[PDB]
């Protein structure tokens, strides 16, 4: 198995696992909520044109990402 | 010859008994003549002569003087090998504690004297004086007296006050301690001290005390006074080159002890002051500690090398120790190695041995056969002849080599197909030639592996080679019975190339009389290898009394499939070669040939497959080129499209519509979808070529492109690597787990530029590092599973149980991931299996369910088969032959004496190394099929509007067709909106349930008026005023911010009459009030007309890898254990938030002591008036396995583990028969705890071996008394291996010092009886062909 | 919030915790603690940064 | 009791660093022999 | 001999086959016997399996023949 084919299986498991773990965080189909779920701000219509199912607004999600940057 | 090995403590008289003298000087040798001294460390008067039958003096040097003792030097004329076995002693001038019996952590001396370790280590190093039988002079025996306290307490007391310090004190304590007198007084206070810690300590000490009386050891033997020295041939002083020498470190440690003992001897001869003699005795005690175990006291002293010295404990313990590194892992004569090459002219049962290696390995065989035929007279003449390698010794050697197997073995021997025996065929060169089919059984390729070859000398080992280890006797994988000799890459390209059609090839539409005409047409060049013709085919079918009924027809085949039909044996039909014949098709063809015809025609068929595959792959000319990677023409457009998309989302992140995290997620998703698009375009561009024609029209066909012909056949690799050749490479990973968002839009038929090539190396370097780190830990799990399952051998033919697991396939939601014919095959029917008419027995009982029986019960559509399992076998220290099943490496039923514990350890470890060495986690019911709904736990109510909502707890969904078997299996939520009624067969395409996790109602049973009594807002509810519609909401609270005036009290959901009379529960004389746990969305009012099943109170809202099979066998307790319903009966809550809630399940006919400390953070599945039986769900998540064994049966942790371990194996795609996890589980939970000790001879709080419990309870019920009941315990596979019976076995995988001290003080014995025991000891194993020898020796003991 | 935990409030008791972290058991003299600390990060014969 | 919390924290997380033991040693003991004897005791 | 399949089904156990053929090969090699089946230039442990294959050597046949060798 030449020691660089098991490397190939490990690397393809790495890429596929990471890319599936990202694509599960795209929340493709959802409901049109029109209001953010931590602020009640009107989420603009171009943003729902981008992502169907954004329960968070742009900058409250930005705050969520900045809080999740470290952990906890 | 000895039959048992007994361990004890060495008597001082016995230490002097082993001795052949006393070592007095720390001199080793003469320094001038290199001679042994007169009484030194390497003495000759004590240990013996340096030369065989020759004195040290030189006088009685003759072989006529054998046995006499010289008068000048005192040596005995013997062999010099007698100083390998002769000990001497060192009489220590002061007693000294054995550090094994003191600085062990149980500390047997400390636990024995009823004093803690700080006491004895203070007294031993001369700090405290200790009272030994102190009369009546105002003292306590076994008391610390510090020096000033001893001095001022010696005042006013003319009694001699009996206060010693050091090992004299501990020795006079250990001698004056009566063990049995203390046992009687300890049991006397045990008559009157039923506490927890008190009784625990009393019985904990009394266990070691009762062992110490029944053993026969003396407690004063733990304090050493005379010291045994090793023989000089076990600490040698070898003379090396140039005058240089080399000793062992035990020489330095014994020299330290002899120095300190001689100096202490002088310091007690000299009447020295007491402080320097205290320091000398403490130094000598420290030297004894450094000699016996250099480092248990601290620190391990280093010599002129800066590593610590190896001591006697370090010479038995450790990785390099004799127990590990020399009792099993040991070099072997009649062995050799060289590299492997292919040489495919071989058959399946021969390896190609070189001729110099066969000249060397078979030397005594050559000598015996060469002088028996008398071509040499002397064995010196034979030696000079075969050193000359004359023209006759090759004839004698090829005579010798004829039927004499050689064990070819390659180094990472993960399973038993790493060692197979081959007949040797003499080749020239220096490389072992090795049959190409078994390269997938050794995992041995030809980039330079070397196979070690051994020779079986004896006729018993020659016959073991021929009868078990021959490569044709092992052609089924012992993990799962599929053949392991699957043709791997060139054979499948040949068999795929010859048997895959072309639309217009030469010689189309001819009619041939058979395969002979087809090979004659192809070999003359009139027909192509794949041209659709009409061949006349004689295919034989044994669909009668083993008949081979022949039938000749006119098939529509190609030429090459007809040519390949000649190598097929009789019993196979023609439709098995009338196809493409990829890799899985040859696997199924060899499997069909085995299942139909047996073992030998499968071997001849696999050889003919290999020959035909290599030959027609050679005649293929199947090259690979640069034009075999056709780059898709739409690849530029998909790359430009994705670059336009990520430009657009780069804009909308510059516009602040999305953040950088969502922008990274969006470009990762966009580039991955574009990579899938490019791969789809090239895979559709590649697999269809255009060919023309019989009539001259365009006609698509499957392309003969060699890269597609390699990917599609399963020759080598799959369409992912073809994506990285022609299509784009994709998104590349990082060692952080992250994904590099700039993908690789190029490939390997074009180039990669410098940036993409630097990007690729993160993932490739991480992959190669994890590969080369996994191979340094290849069989750690195989080792950890042979420790737990060493001594499990099939001993009984049929124990005769009636129990067993009842096997049903893995229907998880929709499809079935693994059917019944995978599992129930080969297992033995524990009962009689009836038809779905429940009228006739299909398979009687005690039957090996082969593929005919499993074909029969799958034609009869049987669904619930109760197999005979290993975890319910009624035999002891073994399994029966039927509770296991069949062999799986042979297809027969298993034999008496197969080591199925080691076999299953290997069949979990060797497929288990194909798993990832690092772990990885990954509305309305979709009703598809039609049929009848079956429900267990079914208590449903009608609604007014025709819908349904189920008010019973675990009513999960089972769909049945008209076949008996389950179709759709799902968990119905508690009160989801059903369009399903009851029992009526519905059609597919209509929702059965509209679930919502925001919806968990407390839907009523009877219709009526929900008035509220004991209902006060403010201390029970929140003030919920929904402005949303203007409804009256009463959303109940937890124990957080309400009062304690209404905390323990619950609000009533009481549904009453139109007048206001309290309606009864149907069946129960209790009222109708459904009191609520936390967070229920209530819409109600007092006195509103609602129907039965009204939505009153809605409640709101797969890991893989080898570490998972690590953690599944170690049986970890997860940090979120799904708590259960410990006892059957209806439920009530308990105390509100003293940290945790309580919950009193109250049995309606039994006692209710269980108010379980339930945390409030893990929310209830249940309501607090909802009857759940034992073994029922409360929390949600990973269920702890010990709770399955305590509550449910032993077949419910057996079904739990072997479905959870196989959920790791089937996730990656590795198949394994589930016998192999069941013999590990059967050896896991062989501990029972006693609860009712009864007339059985065990304590209450006692954990013992279960199959000793089941035989005492067999015999103490066989009298007129009654026996114990037991609660089964389950342990981890590093902890189940701890509680072995042997101490020779246990000291090879556990820590030897803690094992050997625990073994010595018990006076323990080892009747050997085990695989690892007798392997160390040098006997036959009790497993294999040595089972009958352990019958032959267990016959002579009952003589 | 690390001042909310910090039991020391001036430099004389600050060197106490530093001297009892370096060399425990001994009573920290007012010069013995301070001469240890100032030589630890600000003297060329103990703290060499190249 | 601090070394008991060291035992409990080690068995509660499955490991111990040098920082956790050096934070859970007492105040009275100084030199490095006894503390790595304690490391053997916990080891 | 390639496979012992007829031999293991003619005895019924794979390990007692090894023991019985080992006993027969010992008698044929050093004990002093003659091959019951003709040896086609086979080694001694292949004649033993070809004697077991033809039903001519089992455990009880070997034992009653040991009785008869003691009988003189
Ligand atoms: Mg290799
Ligand atoms: Zn927002
Ligand atoms: Zn002599
Ligand atoms: Zn059984």
Strand order of the largest sheet of chain B: 11-13-12-15-10-14
Number of strands of chain C: 0
Largest interface, chains and sizes: A-B, 33 and 39 residues
Tell me roughly what share of residues is in helical segments of chain B.
25-40%
Oligomer: part of a larger assembly
Pfam family, one (chain A): zf-dskA_traR
Zinc finger (dksA C4-type) (chain A): 36-60
Protein name (chain A): Protein TraR
Keywords (chain A): Metal-binding, Plasmid, Zinc, Zinc-finger
Can you characterise this structure?
The structure is cut from a larger assembly and holds chains A (72 residues), B (1343 residues), C (50 residues), D (43 residues) and E (72 residues). Chain A is mainly α and 72 residues long. In chain A, 49% of the residues lie in helices and 0% in strands. Chain A has one domain. The longest helix of chain A has 18 residues. Among the domains of chain B are: 142 residues, Topoisomerase I, Chain A, domain 4 (Orthogonal Bundle), CATH 1.10.132; 53 residues, DNA polymerase, domain 1 (Orthogonal Bundle), CATH 1.10.150. In chain B, 32% of the residues lie in helices and 15% in strands. With 72 residues, chain E is mostly helical. Chain E has one domain: Eukaryotic RPB6 RNA polymerase subunit, CATH 3.90.940.10. Helix content of chain E is 67%, strand content 0%. Chain E is built from four helices and no strands. Chain E starts with a helix and ends with a helix. The chains are: A mainly alpha (72), B alpha+beta (1343), C mainly alpha (50), D mainly alpha (43), E mainly alpha (72). The complex binds magnesium ion and zinc ion (ZN) (3 copies). The site of one zinc ion (ZN) has 9 residues of chain B, from loops.
Could you give a short description of this structure?
This is part of a larger assembly, with chains A (72 residues), B (1343 residues), C (50 residues), D (43 residues) and E (72 residues). With 50 residues, chain C is mostly helical. Chain C has helices spanning 11-22, 32-41.
Question: Topology of this protein?
Answer:
The structure is cut from a larger assembly and holds chains A (72 residues), B (1343 residues), C (50 residues), D (43 residues) and E (72 residues).
Chain B: E1 4-6, H1 12-18, E2 19-22, E3 87-97, H2 108-113, H3 117-124, E4 128-131, E5 144-146, H4 147-154, E6 163-164, H5 167-176, H6 179-190, H7 197-215, E7 223-229, E8 237-239, E9 245-247, H8 249-269, H9 274-292, H10 312-316, H11 322-326, E10 335-341, E11 350-354, H12 355-361, H13 363-372, H14 379-388, H15 393-400, E12 406-409, E13 419-427, E14 432-433, H16 439-442, E15 450-454, H17 459-469, H18 490-498, E16 511-512, H19 515-523, E17 533-541, E18 549-557, H20 559-565, H21 583-597, H22 600-618, H23 635-654, H24 660-686, E19 688-691, E20 699-702, H25 706-712, H26 719-725, E21 730-733, E22 739-744, H27 754-774, H28 780-788, E23 794-796, E24 806-807, H29 820-823, E25 828-829, E26 833-834, E27 841-843, H30 851-859, E28 865-868, E29 879-880, H31 881-884, H32 900-912, E30 920-921, E31 932-935, E32 940-942, E33 948-950, E34 957-960, E35 966-970, E36 977-978, E37 993-994, E38 1008-1011, E39 1025-1026, E40 1031-1032, E41 1054-1056, E42 1081-1082, E43 1089-1090, E44 1097-1098, E45 1103-1104, H33 1106-1113, E46 1124-1125, E47 1130-1133, ...
Parallel strand pairs in B: 2-3, 10-14, 11-13, 16-17, 23-29
Antiparallel strand pairs in B: 1-55, 3-7, 4-5, 4-6, 8-9, 10-15, 12-13, 12-15, 17-18, 19-20, 21-22, 24-28, 25-28, 26-27, 30-45, 31-34, 32-33, 34-35, 36-37, 38-41, 38-43, 39-40, 42-44, 46-51, 47-49, 48-50, 52-53, 52-54
Chain D: H1 3-13, H2 18-24, H3 32-42
Chain E: H1 5-11, H2 14-31, H3 44-53, H4 59-71
Bound molecules: magnesium ion and zinc ion (3 copies).
PDB class: transcription/dna
Keywords: transcription, transcription-dna complex
Entry title: Escherichia coli RNA polymerase promoter unwinding intermediate (TRPi1.5a) with TraR and mutant rpsT P2 promoter
